[PDB]
Copies of this chain bind each other. A is one copy, B any other.
């Protein structure tokens, strides 16, 4: 006896939104904060003074 929402259903059409959609954040810090040395081979030796006169 009436055109209901179930009869109009094919004429009804959902929307989308990006308001809550994000990439993962870049939370990493140690390369940003500490000194970086560019290595050229798997092992590097770092001599240090140990004792003195």
Q: A residues engaging B (CB < 8 A)? A: 5, 12-24, 35, 37, 39-49, 52
Contacts and interface: CB of A to CB of B under 8 A. Distances in A.
Contacts of A23: 49
| Dominant secondary structure of chain A at its interface with chain B | loop
A10 to B, nearest CB: 14
Nearest to A43: B14
Contact of A46 (B20, B24, B46): B20
B37 A14 contact: no
12 contacts: A14-B43, A14-B44, A15-B45, A16-B44, A17-B46, A18-B46, A19-B46, A21-B47, A21-B48, A21-B49, A22-B49, A24-B49
